[PDB]
């Protein structure tokens, strides 16, 4: 009854290379460059004010890159005759991508002035003492080294642990264990890599606020879920990526505080005297970055993309393209000092304020391929099926109101000093994701028609072959 | 001795990569009898234990180790995707036997 | 985790160090109608699944756990000793 | 010439931005460590800056310290819980790592081997204008004192 | 039925989840890609 | 679409265009170079 199987509903999303056609033309544009400044640990703001004096920045912060392209169907070429603007359109295909990084390579670091800790668990010559009040300490550590890259036309989908609603049977007492959520969400800039403490919200599930170094304490570290991402029907989340990361152990500590749940006694034998009290059972490791190398750098190298896991092949719908890049290699924090009094020749710690600023260096250079679309019966459907909005920035040129017409816009002449209502002329908003803030760059002015003049492109040449382009 | 794990790497990960069976040391070639198929997988790489803390009293601004209960929970994540090939068997007696 | 008086588990014990077994049934293909079923005789024959290829998905961010015990049988550090150790007392076990 | 490699403290002038003068070992304290920007350089239309190069470097962490002195900016309290007694005073927030050179090998040596150059990133192909040719070479391997 | 019923361990049922097309899946098309012979309808 | 429609003839060219390679090669080199000085300060 259950599974003995006629039925076939689905019309099968297909490889974009079916209907898309590849043209003969290629272009490039790139930013001059990018860099960002900042303080690693927390943002700087006027103490009374809510306005930021300095934005919080560190390499540990994620980076999102949104890139607009001008609509190629407004363009004009030498041979524009090769297509019909009526029955067809033009869409950009992203052949190859580069990530520039110029900073000299060096490791940053973080810690916290009050860190929940009991003692050193690596070696103990005698049983520890009894927990006092507020034993938290000033200690720091290095985060795991990581390199990854993300490219596609849909924003990167991350995931994290979180607290959800407990099933209601038992009444929660203060100090009970909250239950713990798998949550997907859009990845926002400024968010933090895992430290090896796992993607979750410490703020919610960690009341102590001292269990981790500053930078991540408030924020929610997240991690990209390849599975969920890749298994999109269209792949349009990402059509490509790379990843490198490594970690190893360094120190072994104890959480300090009231035991939430006691170990069953049968797991051990009762002691006495100093051994009557069970020491804190909780251990947490200290993650330690390893030696960085020039070799494992994933950047400053061209990446050609032809075939991808998803059916999308480098197609950017809606003149839109995404790049998500994160690295710890350049995390170096330069320290500087200023003198409040330049007179006295006897060194005094009271004379020097101390500050922390941090550099962030990015560069983008993008190949692009040009592509046209014939419109037919299924075609329009298939797209309209896929995402209809994508269409909308085209003409279609359908229809507009065979979805429906607005019945009317009441436009009624009143000084407003009549008793009649407010009317405010509407409709700026073009972004559904506008809620999501993140880094922005506009290329729209920067295209050129000749790769020869650029450093990157002539590799496009060299790989493919030929010069100028018109010589066999 | 005190055994010690070493530096983990993205490279030596044995997962998230397809496999292709052609040959198997045994004469069984990928045949699943009784509609039955087994997978045994073990890894330590994801062993991370997130620690969390709850407050029994949210009032005092002077911290006290007595104020917080400590708990340990641990995540695990698996996924399975299986190709399968279809196969028929004829009969005779020998085979049946 | 279990209720202290009870024997019923409040929380099941889970860690990556635990082994994992996966049992996977398939429905009997000889019950599964094919778009064209004609290529075989269901009388003289049967149908059995063959497993060509396999995948294992893992999505967690990669990081190492850890374990210890609050009372650990130990004497002293044998890596470096500047003098002969003391005499064994009673219950010298440590948290390590 | 005479200028200093980065120590992992990044390219800047400590003299100007560090008044303490004690924040780094002597050699770099006065000078300005600088670092080549491949981007900027390769952005030359001609490449005539450089038509070729190679690079190798590595580092790892060793020790973890604190700057000692007057706090320039206090950490917002809401990022922690106020202590008391000994815990009333926040210890110095500033950390700096200790960079550490790693094991050298005979293999990674980039020298004592010929290098042929035919095609380059810039349109200049090994052309030396003005009877003039430049070489810049830096290494830490032989640093023995 | 199960002689090993004494043996407890993690359980999953796929019986409902079969489909006749790799193309719609992330993993499969690799099977295609590996052995080649991309056969798909026209659009 | 702003900046593209005009295009006039521009193009740095690959030096291998106009340059010609000859048949002759030479070598020269320094004897060796040697320098001595204190590491920390002059």
Curated annotation (Swiss-Prot), chain A:
Classification via SUPFAM superfamilies: Group I dsDNA viruses
Location in or out of the cell: Virion; Host nucleus
Biological process, per Gene Ontology: endocytosis involved in viral entry into host cell; virion attachment to host cell
Keywords, sorted A to Z: Capsid protein, Disulfide bond, Host nucleus, Host-virus interaction, Late protein, T=7 icosahedral capsid protein, Ubl conjugation, Viral attachment to host cell, Viral penetration into host cytoplasm, Virion, Virus endocytosis by host, Virus entry into host cell
Cross-referenced Gene3D superfamilies: Major capsid L1 (late) superfamily, Papillomavirus
Post-translational modification comment from the UniProt entry: ISGylated by host HERC5, this results in dominant-negative effect on virus infectivity.
GO CC, alphabetical: host cell nucleus; T=7 icosahedral viral capsid
Assembly information from the UniProt record: Self-assembles into homopentamers. The capsid has an icosahedral symmetry and consists of 72 capsomers, with each capsomer being a pentamer of L1. Interacts with the minor capsid protein L2; this interaction is necessary for viral genome encapsidation. Interacts with protein E2; this interaction enhances E2-dependent replication and transcription activation. Interacts with host KPNA2; this interaction mediates the nuclear localization of L1 capsomers. Interacts with host ITGA6. Interacts with host SDC1; this interaction promotes efficient infection of keratinocytes.
Similarity remark: Belongs to the papillomaviridae L1 protein family.
Purpose of the protein: Forms an icosahedral capsid with a T=7 symmetry and a 50 nm diameter. The capsid is composed of 72 pentamers linked to each other by disulfide bonds and associated with L2 proteins. Binds to heparan sulfate proteoglycans on cell surface of basal layer keratinocytes to provide initial virion attachment. This binding mediates a conformational change in the virus capsid that facilitates efficient infection. The virion enters the host cell via endocytosis. During virus trafficking, L1 protein dissociates from the viral DNA and the genomic DNA is released to the host nucleus.
UniProt miscellaneous comment: HPV16, in comparison to HPV types 6 and 11, is more often associated with malignant genital cancers in humans.
Protein name: Major capsid protein L1
Species whose genome carries this gene: Human papillomavirus type 16
Organismal lineage: Viruses, Monodnaviria, Shotokuvirae, Cossaviricota, Papovaviricetes
Protein encoded by which gene: L1
């Amino acid at each position: 009854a259950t599974v003995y199987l006629p039925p076939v509903p689905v019309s099968k999303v297909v490889s974009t290379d079916e209907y898309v056609a590849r043209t003969n033309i290629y272009y490039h544009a790139g930013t001059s460059r990018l860099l960002a400044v900042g303080h690693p640990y927390f943002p700087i703001k006027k103490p009374n004010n809510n306005k930021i004096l300095v934005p919080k920045v560190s390499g540990l912060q994620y980076r999102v890159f949104r890139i607009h392209l001008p609509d190629p169907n407004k363009f004009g070429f030498p041979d524009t005759s090769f297509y019909n603007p009526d029955t067809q359109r033009l869409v950009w295909a992203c052949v190859g991508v580069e990530v520039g990084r110029g900073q000299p390579l060096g490791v940053g670091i973080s810690g916290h002035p009050l860190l929940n800790k009991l003692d050193d668990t690596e070696n103990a010559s005698a049983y520890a003492a009894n927990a006092g009040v507020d034993n938290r300490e000033c200690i720091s550590m290095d985060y795991k080294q990581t390199q990854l890259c993300l490219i596609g036309c849909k924003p990167p989908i991350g995931e994290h642990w979180g607290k959800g609603s407990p099933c209601t049977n038992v009444a929660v007492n203060p100090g009970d264990c909250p239950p713990l959520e798998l949550i997907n969400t859009v990845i926002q800039d400024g968010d933090m890599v895992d430290t090896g403490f796992g993607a979750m919200d410490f703020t919610t599930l960690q009341a102590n606020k001292s269990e981790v170094p500053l930078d991540i304490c408030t924020s929610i570290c997240k991690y990209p879920d390849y599975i969920k991402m890749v298994s999109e029907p269209y792949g349009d989340s990402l059509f490509f990526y790379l990843r490198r990361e490594q970690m190893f152990v360094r120190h072994l500590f104890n959480r300090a505080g009231a035991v939430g749940e006691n170990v069953p006694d049968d797991l051990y034998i009762k002691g006495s005297g100093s051994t009557a009290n069970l020491a804190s059972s909780n251990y947490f490791p200290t993650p330690s970055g390893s030696m960085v190398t020039s070799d494992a750098q994933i950047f400053n190298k061209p990446y050609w993309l032809q075939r991808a896991q998803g059916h999308n092949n480098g197609i950017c719908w809606g003149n839109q393209l995404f790049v998500t890049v994160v690295d710890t290699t350049r995390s170096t924090n330069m320290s500087l000092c200023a003198a409040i009094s330049t007179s006295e020749t006897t060194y005094k710690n009271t004379n020097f304020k101390e500050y922390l600023r941090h550099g962030e260096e990015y560069d983008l250079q993008f190949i692009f391929q040009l592509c046209k679309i014939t419109l037919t019966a299924d075609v329009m459907t298939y797209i309209h099926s896929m995402n209809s909005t994508i269409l909308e920035d085209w003409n279609f040129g359908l229809q507009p109101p065979p979805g429906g017409t607005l019945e009317d816009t009441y436009r009624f002449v009143t000084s407003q000093a009549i008793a009649c209502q407010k009317h405010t002329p509407p409709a700026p908003k073009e972004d559904p994701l506008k809620k999501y803030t993140f880094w922005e760059v506009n290329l729209k002015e920067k295209f050129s028609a000749d790769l020869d003049q650029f450093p990157l492109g002539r590799k496009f040449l060299l790989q493919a072959g030929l010069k100028a382009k018109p010589k066999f």
